[PDB]
Structure formats: C-alpha cells, structure tokens
Amino acid sequence: SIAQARKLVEQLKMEANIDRIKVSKAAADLMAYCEAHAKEDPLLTPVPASENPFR
C-alpha cells in the first residue's frame, strides 16, 4: 500500500498551492447578492394572489 501513500501525499501537495481570500470579501460577496436579488422571490415577499397560480 506504499504506492497508495505516495499518491495521497501528491494529492495533498496539489491542493496546497491555492490562493485564498479573507472572510470579509467572501461575506460581502454574499450579502451584496442577497440584497440585490431580494425583490425577485415569492417566498420572502408574499406577492398578490392575482399572479399566484396555486392559491
């Protein structure tokens, strides 16, 4: 199983060299999307029964 071990260490070395971004930008990129698309869903905002197909 030595060969399997060699592969795993390779796999780890491969994913190690990845650039990362601080949590602030990651949270901002989610809050901005949530705020921008908050007006285009029926669940969060009830919407009038005229356009509701189920009722």
């Binding site: 990845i18 601080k22 949590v23 669940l43 969060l44």
Partner: protein
C-alpha cells in the same frame, strides 16, 4: 516511505495555517445591522395522494409545473402540480429505489436503488408508452443520488465510496472519482455544470472537477454522517446537513465554514437541505415529522412547516421560487407557498 508520509502531515499543517490566517472576522460580526425577515407562515396549497408506501426522493421539473416521485411500492409517478392530476405511472423491475432524477429537457427520467443499476426511461415514445431505454451497471454498491448533467451524460454516486460520470449512448464509465472513505450519500451540480460537490459518510465534503476528474478542496467541519447538500444560487458556497442536528454553510473561496445553524431544543437528524431563489432562506427537513426555515445571514428561525404525520425524506424548490414541495414517509406529497 513513512518519512514521505510525514512531509504530507507537514503540508497539512501549512493548510491549517493558511486557512487560519485569512479569518479576519466571522459573518456574524459582518452582518448585524440588517433587519430580520420577520415571521413567515406557509400554508399548504395542494396535497397529492396515490402512493402505497413511503416516499424517498423527488425532483422538480425544469418547467416549474411537472414533478416526479419514487416510492418503495416500485412505481414512478409524474404529477401535474397545477391541477393535481397524474400523467404517467412507470412500474419498476426492482421495488427498492433511493433516488430519482428529471432531465433538464423534460425528455428522460432516471431511478436507482439497492440493485446496483441506474435505469433511464424515455418519456416521449412515438407509441406513447414509457419503456426502459438503457441500463447502466458497474457499481458495487447501492446508489444514493443521480443527476442529469445534460441530455446525453449522467453523474451518479454509489455506496462503494466512488462517484462516476456515465455515457448514455455507450454505457461505459468515462471518469471515475475516488478518494472518499465512507459511503457517498448525496451530490449536487453547479449552475454552469462545471463542478460538483459530494457529501460522504465520514464527515467530509469534497469539490470535484467534472472535466479533469480530480479533487480540488476538502472540508472537515462536521463530526457525523452527512445526508444532504446543495449550492447557494450564486455558485460560490454550499450548505450541508448532518445527523447531529446542525447545518453548516461553507465557502469555496475562503475554504472554511462561515456559520452554523443549530438550536438546543432539537436533537434529531436532518434529511434534506434546499435554498431559495435569492438564497436568503435556508430550508431543512428533520426527523421531528416537520420542517424548519432558517435565515441564511443571521442563523435564526423564521417559521415552522408542520403537517406531516411521519418523517420528511425529501425537499425541493422550483426554479422560479413559486413553491416548495416536501415528501414524507406518510405516502403524501404537499405543496407550500
């Protein structure tokens, strides 16, 4: 030999230090001035009957009208959500099914279960009778989920700790993804169908590359089995659910979790997880015979979806976000709004 194995542990530390360095501030500190969404109450609009046994899976159609469901009787039923009437009823060779899928073009339907075979059914025969189109084999364990990447190639995850990409025309595996230790229980596809994730039984969710065929990242947040997974609509994050009554929101770019959704009054497992159109609301089904609605950016309850006499085993939100459907072991399907 072992000395090389150490080098790998040293590399693993480096990963931990790199992840810790970027943790400037949690999301809770970032988002606090935002107003709460308030109290949300959803009332049942439709109820579908006709299934003789418990329901295990379902998938909304691309047209936001048709949906499919599978039960342990051994029948796949295609409903019409608008007028609560049936269209098709496909008997199955094997009475145990754990998954089902609906093709994006509305032309094909797949199912799989304890029998290590994924079947594909052609809805639009010239005769007008559903029939088996192809039968895929090669797995050594029960299937857990299957999703149509396109009209010709499908991705499946099985219980032999592997995931594979299939070719319908030929029937041979194109790429095999390996590396998991525990059973694979679910998967979901990105909006552009370029990457996908998978939640194993050993508390580890990975990110795969469909084209290349190699893992890219790994997240080790939970401590128990993972039963559900889904992407944020943006495509930069995903949320998982486990048996320890918690839901965690991860992040691909940051490479660690940001929030956790749990309460002290619930200690039961979680079966299904789904998002909303805007990603503001997180929905998750529990073993408490009911469902809960979370707030994505604040981790606080905003409603309860009760009405099921048994545990919930499925959940799905339509493409335009007009409705959410739940399936339970009570052999009933409900539509909420």
């Amino acid at each position: 030999l072992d000395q090389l194995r150490q080098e790998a542990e040293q590399l693993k530390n480096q990963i931990r230090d790199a992840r810790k360095a970027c943790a400037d501030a949690t999301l809770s500190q970032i988002t606090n001035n935002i107003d709460p969404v308030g109290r949300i109450q959803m009332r049942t609009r439709r109820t579908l009957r006709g299934h003789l046994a418990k329901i295990y899976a379902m998938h909304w159609g691309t047209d936001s009208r048709l949906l499919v469901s599978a039960s342990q009787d051994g029948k796949l039923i295609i409903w019409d959500s608008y007028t609560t009437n049936k269209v098709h009823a496909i008997p199955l060779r094997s009475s145990w099914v754990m998954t089902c899928a609906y093709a994006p073009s509305g032309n094909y339907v797949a199912c799989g279960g304890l029998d290590n075979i994924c079947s594909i059914y052609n809805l639009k025969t010239r005769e007008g009778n559903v029939r088996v189109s192809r039968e895929l084999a090669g797995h050594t364990g029960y299937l857990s989920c299957c999703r149509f990447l396109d009209d010709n190639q499908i991705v499946t995850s099985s219980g032999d700790t592997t995931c594979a990409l299939w070719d319908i025309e030929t029937g041979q595996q194109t790429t095999t993804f390996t590396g998991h230790t525990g059973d694979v229980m679910s998967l979901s596809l990105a909006p552009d169908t370029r990457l996908f994730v998978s939640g194993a039984c050993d508390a580890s969710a990975k990110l795969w590359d469909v084209r290349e065929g190699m893992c890219r990242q790994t997240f080790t947040g939970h401590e128990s089995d993972i039963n559900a997974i889904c992407f944020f609509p943006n495509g930069n994050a995903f949320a998982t659910g486990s048996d320890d009554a918690t839901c965690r929101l991860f992040d691909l770019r940051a490479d660690q979790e940001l929030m956790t959704y749990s309460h002290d009054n619930i200690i039961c497992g979680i079966t299904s997880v789904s998002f909303s159109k805007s990603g503001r609301l997180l929905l998750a089904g529990y073993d408490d015979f009911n469902c809960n609605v979370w707030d994505a950016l604040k981790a606080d309850r905003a409603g309860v979806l009760a009405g099921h006499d048994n545990r919930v085993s499925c959940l799905g939100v339509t493409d335009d976000g007009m409705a959410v459907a739940t399936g339970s072991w009570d052999s009933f399907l409900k539509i909420w709004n």
